[PDB]
Write a protein that holds these residues in place. Structure first.
Motif, PDB file in Angstrom:
ATOM      1  N   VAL A   1       0.903  -1.248  -0.168  1.00  0.00           N
ATOM      2  CA  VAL A   1      -0.098   0.062  -0.060  1.00  0.00           C
ATOM      3  C   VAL A   1       0.811   1.063  -0.053  1.00  0.00           C
ATOM      4  N   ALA A   2       0.381   2.131  -0.780  1.00  0.00           N
ATOM      5  CA  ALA A   2       1.413   3.553  -1.012  1.00  0.00           C
ATOM      6  C   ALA A   2       0.354   4.687  -0.853  1.00  0.00           C
ATOM      7  N   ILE A   3       0.718   5.600  -0.495  1.00  0.00           N
ATOM      8  CA  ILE A   3      -0.156   6.827  -0.371  1.00  0.00           C
ATOM      9  C   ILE A   3       0.642   8.072  -0.925  1.00  0.00           C
ATOM     10  N   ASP A   4       0.023   8.826  -1.698  1.00  0.00           N
ATOM     11  CA  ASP A   4       0.567  10.140  -2.427  1.00  0.00           C
ATOM     12  C   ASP A   4       0.446  10.949  -1.469  1.00  0.00           C
TER      13      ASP A   4
ATOM     14  N   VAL B   1       5.177   7.296   4.113  1.00  0.00           N
ATOM     15  CA  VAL B   1       5.965   8.178   3.257  1.00  0.00           C
ATOM     16  C   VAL B   1       5.603   8.434   1.816  1.00  0.00           C
ATOM     17  N   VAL B   2       5.470   9.571   1.528  1.00  0.00           N
ATOM     18  CA  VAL B   2       4.912   9.841   0.242  1.00  0.00           C
ATOM     19  C   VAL B   2       5.323   8.952  -0.982  1.00  0.00           C
ATOM     20  N   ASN B   3       4.459   8.051  -1.652  1.00  0.00           N
ATOM     21  CA  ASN B   3       4.719   7.315  -2.804  1.00  0.00           C
ATOM     22  C   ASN B   3       5.863   6.177  -2.545  1.00  0.00           C
ATOM     23  N   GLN B   4       6.007   5.919  -1.080  1.00  0.00           N
ATOM     24  CA  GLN B   4       6.861   4.936  -0.896  1.00  0.00           C
ATOM     25  C   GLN B   4       5.870   3.599  -0.221  1.00  0.00           C
ATOM     26  N   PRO B   5       6.183   2.429  -0.889  1.00  0.00           N
ATOM     27  CA  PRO B   5       5.309   1.204  -0.309  1.00  0.00           C
ATOM     28  C   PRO B   5       5.532   0.661   1.107  1.00  0.00           C
TER      29      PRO B   5
END
Lengths: 129, 229
Positions: free
Chosen positions: A52-55, A88-92
């Motif tokens: 899961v990654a969050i922008d 952490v932004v865009n880090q899975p």
């Protein structure tokens, strides 16, 4: 038979902070861990790893906007309630499913020159198998 | 909104012109989705996606009413290079129709094969890969330190096929070493990747020569020998 073609039911199956106008002087809490929360359920006997990654929001810096103005207030989301683990932004971040149980994808949120009514942002949540 | 995706590990064999992925809205609410396929590589030891025309997804956009099951047709436009395995991601984007709200995106891996190599998930491709010495992942590892001082593990796949790794062990009977933070797992064919590892694992690692990865790329989970560079 042959082999098992795994198939998964991915979430969900929002983060309302309250008010960020004027002054607060402490960190604001909102949680989705609301209309229900996100979870992955797979169907093998094996476990399935996923990610899961969050922008960084519509502005890449995880900042709300008042809509009426250029008023912006920053934030961040975390995997654990304690907020030790930043999405952490865009880090899975790694996840795993245990056979026949749903794996939650928890998201805990947090946040003075006062700014004064209703602010917004939208986060892209990528689930990767 | 809620989706059942099947199969999560789709492949297009060398002699198939297409395959299907099924997408079912199991929620109680109508959903709208965008469908795209990106070519997938690990150049520069990071994962990179590019737009691509070797695989065409149909429909590119779909209204999926509640309870309905739609058939995604993934089509192979032209035959792919001999003996090679091509890597993609199917990306499914759920279109929307003081707060902060979530847009979901679901990504499954897709793999297509050229003449003489195959997934290994059917008896036809199993028999095809037995005749190919490199129709498998063939891994090597080495841990190296950054100028900033961060420790990072290098995995290099010499084989014509990918590896999906759930864990690294130091011996065939040992326990999984505690890969702390930072996800890892896929080492594509003919690539090398680079995971950030904490100090606990460098040392533990590199006190041994061979290590073993748990690999789901084939039919069942199986250990694979990773040797040192």
């Amino acid at each position: 038979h042959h082999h098992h073609s795994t198939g998964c039911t991915v979430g969900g199956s929002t983060l309302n902070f309250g008010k960020t106008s004027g002054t607060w002087n402490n960190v604001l809490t909102a949680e989705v861990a609301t209309g229900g929360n996100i979870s992955v359920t797979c169907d093998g006997t094996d476990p399935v790893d996923f990610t899961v990654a969050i922008d960084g929001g519509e502005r890449t810096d995880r900042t709300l906007k008042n809509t009426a103005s250029a008023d912006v207030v920053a934030y961040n989301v975390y995997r654990d309630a304690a907020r030790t683990n930043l999405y952490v932004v865009n880090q899975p971040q790694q996840f795993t499913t245990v056979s026949g149980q749903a794996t939650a994808v928890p998201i805990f949120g947090a946040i003075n020159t006062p700014k004064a009514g209703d602010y917004k942002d939208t986060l892209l949540v990528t689930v990767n198998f | 909104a809620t989706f059942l995706i099947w199969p999560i590990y789709p492949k297009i064999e060398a002699n198939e012109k297409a395959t299907a992925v099924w997408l079912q809205n199991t929620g109680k609410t109508d959903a709208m989705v965008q469908i795209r396929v990106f070519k997938w590589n690990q150049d520069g030891l990071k994962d990179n996606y590019s737009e691509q025309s070797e695989i065409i997804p149909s429909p590119p956009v779909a209204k999926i009413k509640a309870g309905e099951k739609h058939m995604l047709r993934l089509t192979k436009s032209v035959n792919l290079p001999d003996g090679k395995e091509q890597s993609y991601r199917l990306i499914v984007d759920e279109l929307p129709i003081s707060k902060v709200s979530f847009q979901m995106r679901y990504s499954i891996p897709l793999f297509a094969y050229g003449k003489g190599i195959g997934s290994g998930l059917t008896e036809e491709s199993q028999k095809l890969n037995a005749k190919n010495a490199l129709a498998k992942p063939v891994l090597q590892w080495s841990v190296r330190n950054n100028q900033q001082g961060q420790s990072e593990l290098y995995l290099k796949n010499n084989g014509q096929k990918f590896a999906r790794l759930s864990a690294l062990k130091t011996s065939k009977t040992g326990n999984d070493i505690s890969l702390g933070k930072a996800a890892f797992g896929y080492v594509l064919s003919n690539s090398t990747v680079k995971f950030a590892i904490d100090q606990s694992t460098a040392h533990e690692l590199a006190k041994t020569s061979k290590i073993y990865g748990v690999d789901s790329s084939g039919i069942k989970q199986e250990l694979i020998e990773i040797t040192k560079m």
